[PDB]
């Protein structure tokens, strides 16, 4: 089997990616947030904290024929940046893009922090990291991909982020026609339950690529750019006018100002990542002060290379026995 979705911007800065998902008999379809860097599937639901809610499209299970509570399980999770969730279980039919989970665990929210509620086009997570992270208890249980691969016709999916358009997630299968080029593989370790692997250096605009080892995790759940403090630093010494604002939380830069690109090795590979990706706006409304998209790591114990660079490629997420990572430019 394959499965083939859309995948959109929530917004005019692409912050965020919504994937519509169909969970239960009939279908509920939910808009939810495909996240490399987590493992469970949760959603807004008829349980939450009914203040909680402003605008989500809710999973209410007692209208789906085939949902079934999963007796004593609870969850309970908390990202980065310092958002939460947590409720009950059910297992449910779930399908995207006309591929079919029978028996899936969907997490229903009892509970979300403020800016899960404040996020009104975001119904829930759909993690697709390794289950060794899921925080389902007191039964750990497995993410939609892993219960879809052995269906698979190759036990692999592919993320295909738009710049401020939208793109596609695949199961299954690899696109030919989605990138240009080959598509270079890496290695993935497992050990921290993340897509994990390793840069092999950076480039700064037109400047001389830098090899060094960079560890970082493939995060569709994340917008920018985690890097470490000295590839940073060697980034923004090239806008004129850019610093580091404590007060903003990061690197800030004149909104008049031509951002170069930024380039990422994959291997012998390169990815380059166009310099208006790297642009996030004003830091509030009306500012000439505009937040950028390349951030520093120190301080996350992590280097993330989230949305800002992964919607640069056509990403293989290779489940295989030994998983591995694939990158093309496209």
Same mark, same amino acid.
Request: glycine share 6%.
């Given at each position: 089997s394959t499965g083939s979705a859309t995948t959109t911007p929530i917004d005019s800065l692409d912050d965020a990616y919504i994937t519509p998902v169909q969970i239960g008999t009939p279908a509920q379809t939910l808009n939810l947030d495909?996240? @490399?860097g987590s493992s469970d599937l949760w959603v807004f639901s008829s349980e939450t904290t009914a203040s909680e809610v402003d605008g989500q499209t809710i999973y209410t299970?007692?209208?789906?024929?085939?949902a079934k509570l999963l007796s004593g399980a609870t969850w309970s999770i908390s990202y980065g940046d310092g958002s939460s969730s947590s409720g009950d279980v059910y297992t449910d039919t779930v399908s995207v893009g006309g591929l079919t989970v029978t028996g899936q665990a969907v997490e229903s929210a009892k509970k979300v922090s403020s800016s899960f509620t404040e996020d009104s086009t975001i119904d829930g997570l759909l993690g697709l990291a390794?289950?060794?992270?899921?925080?389902?208890?007191p039964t750990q249980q497995k993410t939609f991909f892993d219960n879809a691969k052995a269906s698979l016709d190759s036990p692999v999916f592919t993320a295909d982020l738009g710049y401020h358009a939208p793109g596609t997630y695949n199961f299954?299968?690899?696109? @030919?026609? =989605?990138?240009?080029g080959s598509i270079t593989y890496t290695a993935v370790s497992t050990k921290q339950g993340f897509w994990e692997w390793t840069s092999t250096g950076y480039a700064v605009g037109s400047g001389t690529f830098k090899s060094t080892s960079i560890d970082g995790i493939a995060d569709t759940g994340t917008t920018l750019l985690y890097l470490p403090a000295t590839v940073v630093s060697a980034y923004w =010494?090239?806008?004129?006018? =850019?610093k580091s604002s404590s007060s903003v939380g990061g690197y800030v830069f004149p909104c008049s100002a031509t951002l170069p690109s930024f380039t990422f090795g994959v291997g012998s590979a390169r990815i380059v990542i166009p310099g208006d990706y790297i642009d996030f706006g004003p830091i509030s409304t009306g500012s000439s002060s505009c937040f950028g998209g390349i951030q520093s790591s120190a301080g996350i114990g992590i280097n993330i290379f989230g949305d800002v660079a992964l919607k640069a490629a056509f990403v293989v997420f290779n489940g295989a026995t030994t998983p591995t990572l694939g990158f093309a430019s496209k």
């Open positions: 495909f996240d @490399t299970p007692s209208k789906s024929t085939t390794f289950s060794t992270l899921n925080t389902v208890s299954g299968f690899i696109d @030919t026609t =989605a990138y240009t =010494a090239q806008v004129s006018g =850019a």
